[PDB]
Design a protein around this ligand. Structure first.
Ligand code: HEM
Ligand SMILES: NCc1ccccc1
Length: 292
């Protein structure tokens, strides 16, 4: 059995990690022009998810622990196209705090982004330890977007995620946009795409979606308001179990925030054993909370 035990970066405590959080958050505030003024928040969230989403619950391969996205096999994964922008953003942060592990930095990037975009607090635990190049998972473990609800359900079960967790996690698609050159899909999902809200669910239910081909010859669902949904997004209103949960989050952002926060922490922690002596999860203050 392959076990990854969280090991606190030697001599570091909450306050050290809050400094890393603050550095990420200050750079997010500064680099506001990225991606036609969306900023780096969305791509940092996606990065944190993609480095975690290689996990296989069956044998504990992949996952966030080893920081293996730093190795070319994984950063050149076609599924990861575009995330190099997030990695470059993080580079000066890692230079300022060389003591932090790669897995901790990439996951913390995602937590910082959600919180600074006015999303829920996400508790975060340190202790991921870099592992060598030969532990890098092969490409092909991240999901396709052209598929239906059955595929989504099956895919997420490899990450030990159930229906509620799947629907909550997908609400992160409120953020950012699809880019044709990265994924073969093009367009934003709504108007509020650098503030964390339940817009994904509202738009799914309330927009008039038309199935169209895009300029890469892939099918996607497009609205007259200039928004789109991936086939896997749209599957959440096709499957009856998913649809019920989509309605719940559309009606109650607070519930969405609570369930997202739990699911996102779990996603970022899959594969990691936290010893009983480990620090409690950290809840970082926002820059606003600190007057910074
Ligand atoms: C069935 C599962 C999923 C599929 C098929 C999927 C697919 C995609 C695709 C195709 C893109 C566009 C990438 C690009 O063109 O730049 C995207 C973007 C994004 N994904 Fe997902 N995704 C899934 C789940 C998730 C999850 C679980 C999260 C995080 C909790 C997430 C967060 C994001 C974010 C924040 C973006 C915007 C990135 C940006 O604007 O640069 N996705 N996703
Ligand atoms: N619903 C369109 C979408 C998908 C992924 C990321 C942003 C927006």
């Amino acid at each position: 059995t392959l076990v990854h035990v969280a090991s606190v970066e030697k001599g570091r405590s909450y306050e050290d990690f809050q400094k890393v959080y603050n550095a990420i958050a200050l750079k997010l505030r500064e680099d506001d022009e990225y991606d036609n003024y969306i900023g780096y928040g969305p791509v940092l969230v996606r990065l944190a998810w993609h480095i975690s989403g290689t996990w296989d619950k069956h044998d504990n391969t992949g996952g966030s622990y080893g920081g293996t996205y730093r190795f070319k096999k994984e950063f050149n994964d076609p599924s990861n196209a575009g995330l190099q922008n997030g990695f470059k953003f993080l580079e000066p942060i890692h230079k300022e705090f060389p003591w932090i592990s790669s897995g901790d930095l990439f996951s913390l990037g995602g937590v910082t982004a959600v919180q600074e975009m006015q999303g829920p607090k996400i508790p975060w635990r340190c202790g991921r330890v870099d592992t060598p190049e030969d532990t890098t998972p092969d490409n092909g473990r991240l999901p396709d977007a052209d598929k239906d609800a059955g595929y989504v359900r099956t895919f997420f079960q490899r990450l030990n995620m159930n229906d509620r967790e799947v629907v909550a996690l997908m609400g992160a698609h409120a953020l950012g946009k699809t880019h044709l050159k990265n994924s073969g899909y093009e367009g934003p999902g709504g108007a509020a795409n650098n503030v964390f809200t339940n817009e994904f669910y509202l738009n799914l239910l309330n927009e008039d979606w038309k199935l169209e081909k895009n300029d890469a010859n892939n099918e996607q669902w497009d609205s007259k308001s200039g928004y789109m949904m991936l086939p896997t997004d749209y599957s959440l209103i096709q499957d009856p179990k998913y649809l019920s949960i989509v309605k719940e989050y559309a009606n109650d952002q607070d519930k969405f925030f609570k369930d997202f926060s739990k699911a996102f922490e779990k996603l970022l922690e899959n594969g990691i054993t936290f010893p009983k002596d480990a620090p409690s999860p950290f809840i970082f203050k926002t820059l606003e909370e600190q007057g910074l």
